[PDB]
Write a protein that binds this ligand. Structure first.
Ligand SMILES: Cc1cc2nc3c(=O)[nH]c(=O)nc-3n(C[C@H](O)[C@H](O)[C@H](O)COP(=O)(O)O)c2cc1C
Ligand SMILES: O=C1c2ccccc2C(=O)c2c1nnn2-c1cc(F)c(-c2ccccc2F)c(F)c1
Ligand SMILES: CCCCCCCCCCCC[N+](C)(C)[O-]
Ligand SMILES: O=C(O)c1cc(=O)[nH]c(=O)[nH]1
Ligand code: NA
Ligand code: NA
Ligand code: NA
Length: 365
């Protein structure tokens, strides 16, 4: 356990980073993971990490965020890594290549990444068939407390965003425990303006109509993923629409187009979304705000800069029922998953919580 953690963090990951540009490193990571070539997680999930939310049981509250497995190629390997749930995507209706390279950048001095992938996607049809090939295996995983989420995007040339998301609901909704309407990528022109009130109500109404039209056992929860860069007005409007329409949850947050003071990485002024540690507290505060605006009645998946049990528990106490991580894998590798879970369990005990559930939103009380 603690042996693998130090080796990866101090030797293997720094060496890989020295050899491989970040996009190549990412592709290698997906390949190894899909093949199960992993220091298989020794951490056994205890009962106090279990969470019931979004109509499902989650064996532990630590998931892999969207964007690592964009095309649904490494799902089983990710459960093997110890994640309590997996989110794939973003997936666009038609295949598209995304932005020209280079489009991913490491900021090691900041434990951050900047990316401008631009929704590179194999498309709905390819991902549909990939998930169908393991659909019953996933049904059993979900029943055993390991749910699957699918994050939906829209094509660059799309004339009608709502129809792109609707198509995603129809094609991948039946294969997902939850769907994510990603209106917060900073790398698709016009996308984030879908977060405005009039736009958003129309868009989410259509999405929910399509979802409701699926057969009961194929009917996923629907969540909205938002940016950390919203005005107070934007956040109020999103909270209002979410409650009005009965949206099932929020994912808080995507990457930031802001550049917090103090970044040291040479590549800090590259265009794209910033992730990792400089995002952490901006994300946590957005969780805190959205939880209060929704009166704690709308489940939140908290994400941004998590690499320790403390980071996870801060988001949980701020209002998150579940958390996700991605960028920490860059710097710590696969052992970071067991690390976060072990540290989270220890902190829950230290602070007198019976389990994760007791800690959700605790700062507000
Ligand atoms: C390289 C990269 C690609 C990403 N791609 C997506 C994506 O396709 N869809 C999405 O909703 N979020 C995407 N994200 C955002 C992550 O899901 C997450 O919200 C964000 O990175 C903050 O978490 P982290 O600090 O633990 O990385 C991506 C992030 C990174 C770093
Ligand atoms: O810079 C990035 C970066 C940027 C933007 C998205 C993603 C990545 C990224 O995955 C990455 C980066 N640098 N190293 N990795 C990296 C390399 C690996 F080999 C693994 C791995 C996986 C399974 C078993 C053993 C391992 F070692 C891993 F988890 C992460
Ligand atoms: C309030 C705005 C702050 C912007 C971002 C804050 C980053 C905090 C630094 C802790 C990260 C740890 N490390 C190794 C990456 O330096
Ligand atoms: O594909 C990308 O560029 C991307 C999508 C998203 O939602 N977030 C992010 O940081 N990048
Ligand atoms: Na399934
Ligand atoms: Na379902
Ligand atoms: Na405002």
């Amino acid at each position: 356990a603690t042996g693998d953690e130090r080796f990866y963090a101090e030797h293997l990951m720094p060496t890989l980073q020295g050899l491989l540009d970040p996009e190549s490193a990412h592709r290698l990571a997906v390949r190894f993971t899909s093949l199960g070539l992993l220091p298989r997680a020794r951490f056994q999930d205890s009962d106090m990490l279990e969470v019931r939310v979004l109509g499902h049981k989650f064996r532990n509250p630590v998931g892999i965020a969207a964007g690592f497995d964009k095309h649904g190629e490494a799902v089983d390997g990710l459960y093997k890594m110890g994640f309590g749930f997996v989110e794939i995507g973003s997936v666009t209706p038609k295949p598209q290549e995304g932005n020209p390279r280079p489009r991913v950048f490491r900021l090691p001095e900041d434990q951050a990444v900047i990316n401008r992938y631009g929704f590179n996607s194999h498309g709905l049809s390819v991902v549909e068939h990939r998930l169908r090939a393991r659909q019953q295996k996933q049904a059993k995983l979900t029943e055993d407390g390991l749910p699957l989420g699918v994050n939906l995007g829209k094509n660059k040339t799309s004339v009608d965003a709502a129809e792109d998301y609707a198509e995603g609901v129809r094609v991948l909704g039946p294969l997902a425990d939850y769907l994510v309407v990603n209106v917060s990528s900073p790398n698709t022109a016009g996308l984030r303006s879908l977060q405005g009130k009039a736009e958003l109500r129309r868009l989410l109404t259509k999405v929910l109509q399509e979802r409701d039209g699926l057969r009961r056992v194929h009917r996923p929860a629907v969540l909205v993923k938002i940016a950390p860069d919203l005005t107070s007005q934007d956040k109020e409007d999103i909270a209002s629409v979410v409650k009005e329409l009965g949206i099932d949850g929020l994912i808080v947050t995507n990457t930031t187009v802001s550049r917090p003071a103090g970044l040291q990485g040479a590549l800090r002024s590259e265009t794209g979304g910033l992730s990792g540690k400089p995002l952490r507290d901006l994300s946590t505060q957005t969780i805190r705000e959205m939880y209060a605006l929704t009166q704690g009645r709308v489940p939140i998946i908290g994400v941004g800069g998590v690499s320790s049990g403390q980071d996870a528990l801060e988001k949980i106490r701020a209002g998150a029922s579940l958390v996700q991580l991605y960028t920490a894998l860059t710097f710590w590798g696969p052992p970071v998953v067991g690390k976060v879970k072990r540290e989270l369990e220890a902190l829950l005990k230290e602070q007198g919580f019976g389990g994760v559930t007791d800690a959700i939103g605790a700062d507000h009380r």
